[PDB]
Design a protein around this ligand. Structure first.
Ligand SMILES: *CCS(=O)(=O)Nc1ccc(C2=N[C@@H](CC(=O)OC(C)(C)C)c3nnc(C)n3-c3sc(C)c(C)c32)cc1
Ligand SMILES: [Zn+2]
Lengths: 782, 19, 158, 105
């Protein structure tokens, strides 16, 4: 197959943030890592001034600033998810900004089990080394010197296999790590010294001490204090050897603290963000002893107020704090000495739009296509209306998690599945609790699921239906069925109990929203979770646990089973085209079914037998089936045209592979441009808020753009010196192959921005530059 | 009121002044 | 039930096949309760999904993962996750509703998992088709035919 | 006489014994049962259906020639298969009927 993938909206979720002096010795810089993007801001009188935004050929997992001795300004260390390590330097020579790759390498190991808590990258305070926790039982040390241009690292065996979090401590004569680990005896905190010349671990300054069961975060405190602050679930502790200081404030019991940031350079004040979005300030009280040394007297936590749910926090300057969110919009907030009379010392200054996570979306015409996405989660959950302008985004906050969306044109309303958390009592007012009209279904923290009928124009919750206790709503469709002229809202549900592995119960509830009212038209009791539902030629195609069932709508306004298919593990996704059905499995990739109208049953055509942990499926055409899996890869499967035997004909062949670097949640047919080298248009929405487009090209077009990819890869310089072929290579923990049948549209589009001499070098002996500029412009206009 | 937010670090007092 | 009898028959002949490659008895599918080994019919299911296969007919089948990846369940193989339940819930909140439900179910079920201790395709096809005493000898069936017949039988009987 | 022989063969085809007689109802197909050794370890193959066809062909001269073929069948099984095996025990079982009703011929 020949496919063209291009980013329409860059990822918006913030995965990392740091402050330092990177662009110059005087500039105060905020660096933000959004997956594959690195943004550099200068803190100024007017706020954050962006100076350079860069794209990397990798998923940024570590991003740390450090200043070696003799360096006039901070150097950056970046590690990617594909273990591409680079030491970068910001270089400015007058109106020209370059990110110089001081050092680059790949620090992956041939053998190694990736750690549960993920890649950890820490830097020694004296910049003697970079430590990487990549695999269980292996601590990778990269010595920092001017001669180690290749990042020639070495591994030290770590006895503690289950390490939770590790930092380098301050004020140690030798490089020292302090980490929290789990063993059969619980969770503990331990220290080691690293010897570069000996290439080994030595005993830490202070012996191990037992910590909380859910101790999850390590904070290395600067001098004068030294030591570390361990943060868990319901306690905060400080360990500096003989000095142990634990507190258990009730205020932190309600939510888990997920991020921290040091405010004062001496470590007397810290910011702590929790999962509910609450911002606390940890305070370390000083005690200057008469001996001349400074010790810690007490720990205090104060509720500063409420922010966006923080993935990361960073104090910039003058009481201003950047809050980088992946579940909601990021924000600059201001800390004030005096409260707002509401008891809150935090005042929001600026909001940065984040579309992540995009759990579902749809294309509507409210001849110009608009995307409506279910974005965010919990109090950050909202609807996002994206249209071409570049992209214009309108936010409709729901204050609860949206899960599914379907447009009902005849009713001029959207149907949205939503969930809220109650303790029952709701934790805050939300869309489901502030509906104009509300109803409840007839026949610790709990999830309450609702169907919201929301006005298309005002985006106000017209109605909210509360489903049964322990009932989760999974699938939603707006369609007409059979001979019934009414358009219905069909919801697939599942009763959830801890006693059950698979749901033994579930429901298909058919509602009608008419005259600004919601009534339950029909209720069907099924024996499992209704994962997916599609309107299939006037009939209702549903997936219930491991079965795909086609129902008919009778004249009595009830569903009657027409046919069943059982050859699935867990039919999560369903797409249809004509009489074809694409069944996405939990692990068994994609299956092609053909409904047979003359037999009234399903027929299996071909299954992709490569195990793929599917996250979203789509049908490109009758032959091509596009799928996304949880290792951030896209694949395209075809029916084997050269199949001569039946066994060959039972196989869907993976003819296209491509490492996207994004976790695709939803595929939809539609375009954001007004109604060309490419045919077709499929939008996809991902966890990080990135939105992409997949199109199809012919043989000649694909060949030309692949040759251009090769030429551009030869010409274009990569940040971190990562090869584009390596980055786009299909990659799981099991299998790695080069990308096939996929043109990286971003690479091709980048051709228009290179210098004309570089254009001539690229198109030399291909063909003038003007024709190919026209080609790339036509590609852009899709 | 909040004596623990009194002395928040200042790198440059001009920063965020003209927000 | 007739389906159970046919499953028993199929199992009792495949127990002699040296080319047969059954699904790993310690597979996460048994642990996740997505396959039920109490009743013999599970073999038929595994035949339908090409989880159990004949190596003579299918020599180059892609291996089935033994345990789901961390993204898929959030549980290390037969180990309690280090990550706090709140963090796992927050991570699962980023998934589409079907995948979110599947991931929470897999987490909940595989948290309690404990390890399990460790070509007659033509005649099996005839057995499943219930045409052992009627088909001509000339008829030849591969694992493809056996799979198709098993799928048809499960469709009719389940 | 051979009418009696046919009666024993039908009483072996009879549905009462089919729980153990079923493997012997037709020749041992080698392509279907994956037994790529039969032609070597067994030279002349016999089955209940071939015996029935030879009765219909009146090819037997006497009840002992019928006994000879039905013995060559049980022998072929008792030989090609390990003892303790199931087909050797449903063979042992089927020989039982043959003998109990032949001994009364
Ligand atoms: C599993 C059902 S069982 O009835 O409990 N046991 C059972 C019945 C028949 C056979 C047959 N065995 C073969 C030799 C053999 O072991 O073949 C494989 C099972 C394919 C490996 C055999 N030797 N002599 C004869 C008449 N047979 C036949 S013909 C036939 C049809 C079958 C299934 C057998 C094994 C186990
Ligand atoms: Zn076979």
């Amino acid at each position: 197959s020949y496919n063209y993938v291009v980013t329409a909206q860059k990822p918006t979720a913030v995965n990392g943030c740091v402050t330092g002096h990177f662009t110059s010795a005087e500039d105060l810089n905020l660096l933000i890592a959004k997956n594959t993007r690195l943004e550099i801001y200068v803190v100024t009188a007017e706020g954050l001034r962006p100076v350079k935004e860069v794209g990397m050929y990798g998923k940024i997992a570590v991003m740390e600033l450090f200043r070696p001795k003799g360096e006039s300004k901070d150097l950056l260390f970046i590690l990617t998810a594909k273990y591409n390590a680079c030491i970068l330097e910001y270089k400015q020579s007058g109106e020209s900004i370059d990110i110089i790759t001081r050092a680059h390498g790949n620090v992956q190991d041939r053998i190694g089990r990736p750690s549960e808590t993920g890649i950890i990258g820490i830097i020694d305070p004296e910049c003697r080394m970079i430590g990487l926790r990549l695999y269980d039982g292996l601590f990778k040390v990269i010595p920092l010197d001017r001669d180690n241009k290749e990042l020639k690292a070495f591994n030290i065996r770590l006895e503690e296999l289950h390490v939770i979090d590790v930092k380098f401590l301050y004020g140690c004569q030798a490089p020292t790590i302090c980490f929290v680990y789990q063993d059969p005896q619980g969770r503990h905190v331990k220290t080691y010294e690293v010897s570069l010349r000996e290439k080994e671990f030595n005993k830490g300054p202070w012996k191990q001490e037992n910590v909380e069961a859910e101790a999850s975060m390590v904070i290395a405190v600067p001098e004068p204090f030294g030591g570390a602050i361990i943060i868990g679930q319901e306690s905060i502790t400080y360990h500096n050897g003989d000095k142990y200081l634990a507190i258990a404030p009730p205020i932190i019991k309600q939510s888990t603290i997920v991020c921290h940031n040091r405010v004062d350079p001496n470590g007397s004040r810290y910011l702590l963000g929790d999962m509910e979005g609450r911002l606390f300030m940890l305070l370390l009280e000083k005690e200057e002893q008469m001996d001349g040394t400074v010790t810690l007297k007490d720990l205090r936590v104060e509720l500063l107020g409420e922010t966006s749910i923080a993935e990361c926090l960073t104090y910039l300057d003058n009481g201003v704090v950047f809050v980088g969110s992946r579940l909601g919009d990021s924000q600059l907030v201001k800390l004030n000495v005096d409260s707002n009379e509401q008891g809150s010392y935090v005042v929001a200054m600026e909001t940065f739009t984040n579309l992540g996570p995009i759990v579902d979306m749809c294309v509507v015409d409210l001849g110009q296509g608009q995307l409506v996405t279910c974005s965010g989660a919990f109090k950050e959950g909202s609807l996002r209306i994206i249209r071409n302008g570049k992209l214009h985004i309108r936010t409709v906050p729901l204050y609860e998690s949206p899960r599914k969306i379907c447009y009902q044109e005849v009713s001029q309303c959207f149907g949205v599945l939503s969930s809220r958390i109650e303790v029952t009592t709701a934790l805050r007012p939300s869309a489901s609790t502030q509906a104009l009209s509300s109803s409840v279904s007839s026949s610790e923290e709990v999830e309450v699921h609702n169907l919201l009928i929301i006005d298309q124009h005002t985006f106000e919750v017209l109605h909210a239906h509360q489903f049964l206790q322990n009932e989760y709503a999974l699938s939603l469709v707006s369609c007409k069925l059979g001979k019934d002229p009414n358009t219905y809202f069909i919801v697939g549900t599942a009763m959830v109990y801890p006693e059950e592995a698979e749901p033994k119960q579930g429901r298909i509830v058919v509602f009608q929203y008419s005259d600004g009212k919601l009534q339950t038209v029909a209720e069907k009791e099924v024996k499992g979770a209704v994962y997916s539902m599609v309107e299939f030629n006037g009939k209702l195609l549903a997936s219930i646990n491991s079965t795909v069932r086609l129902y008919e709508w009778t004249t009595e306004k009830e569903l009657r089973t027409e046919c069943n298919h059982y050859n699935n593990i867990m039919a999560l996704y369903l797409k249809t085209k004509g009489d074809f059905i694409l069944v996405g499995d939990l692990m068994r990739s994609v299956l092609l079914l053909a409904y047979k109208p003359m037999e009234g049953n399903f027929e299996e055509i071909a299954r992709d037998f490569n195990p793929n942990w599917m996250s979203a499926v789509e049908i490109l055409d009758d032959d091509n089936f596009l799928g996304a899996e949880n290792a951030f890869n896209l694949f395209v499967c075809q029916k084997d045209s050269a199949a001569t035997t039946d066994e060959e004909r039972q196989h869907l062949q993976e003819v296209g592979l491509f490492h996207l670097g994004e976790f695709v949640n939803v595929f939809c047919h539609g375009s954001l441009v007004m109604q060309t080298p490419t045919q077709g248009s499929v939008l996809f929405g991902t966890v990080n808020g990135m939105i992409g487009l997949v199109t199809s090209l012919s043989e000649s077009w694909y060949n030309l753009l692949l040759d251009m990819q090769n030429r551009l890869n030869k010409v274009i310089k990569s940040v971190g010196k990562i090869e584009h072929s390596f980055w786009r290579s299909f990659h799981t923990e099991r299998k790695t192959e080069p990308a096939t049948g996929f043109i990286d549209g971003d690479l091709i589009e980048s051709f228009l921005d290179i210098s004309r001499p570089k254009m001539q070098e690229v198109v030399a002996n291909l063909a003038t530059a003007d024709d190919l500029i026209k080609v790339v412009e036509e590609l852009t206009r899709i | 009121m909040a004596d623990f937010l009194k002395g928040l670090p200042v790198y440059n007092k001009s920063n965020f002044s003209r927000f | 039930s007739p389906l159970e009898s046919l499953a028993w028959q199929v199992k009792c002949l495949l127990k002699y096949s040296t080319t047969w490659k059954p699904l790993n008895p310690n597979s996460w599918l048994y642990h996740a309760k997505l396959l039920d080994p109490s009743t013999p019919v599970h073999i038929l299911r595994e035949i339908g999904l090409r989880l159990s296969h004949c190596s003579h007919c299918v020599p180059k089948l892609e291996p089935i993962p033994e345990w789901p990846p961390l993204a898929s369940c959030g549980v290390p193989p037969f180990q309690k996750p280090l990550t706090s339940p709140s963090r796992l819930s927050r991570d699962h909140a980023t998934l589409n509703g079907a995948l979110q439900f599947a991931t929470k179910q897999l987490s909940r079920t595989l948290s309690r998992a404990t390890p399990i201790p460790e070509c007659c395709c033509g005649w099996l096809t005839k057995t499943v088709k219930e045409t052992t005493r009627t088909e001509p000898i000339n008829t030849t069936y591969s694992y493809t035919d056996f799979q198709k017949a098993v799928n048809k039988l499960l469709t009719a009987s389940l | 006489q051979l009418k009696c022989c046919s009666g024993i063969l039908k009483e072996m085809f009879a549905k009462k014994h089919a729980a153990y007689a079923w493997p012997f109802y037709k020749p041992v197909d080698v392509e279907a049962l994956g037994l790529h050794d039969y032609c070597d370890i067994i030279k002349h193959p016999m089955d209940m259906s071939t015996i029935k066809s030879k009765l219909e062909a009146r090819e037997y001269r006497d009840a002992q020639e019928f006994g000879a073929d039905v013995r060559l069948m049980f022998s072929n099984c008792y030989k090609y298969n390990p003892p303790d095996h199931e087909v050797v025990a449903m063979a042992r079982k089927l020989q039982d009927v043959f003998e109990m009703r032949f001994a009364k011929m």
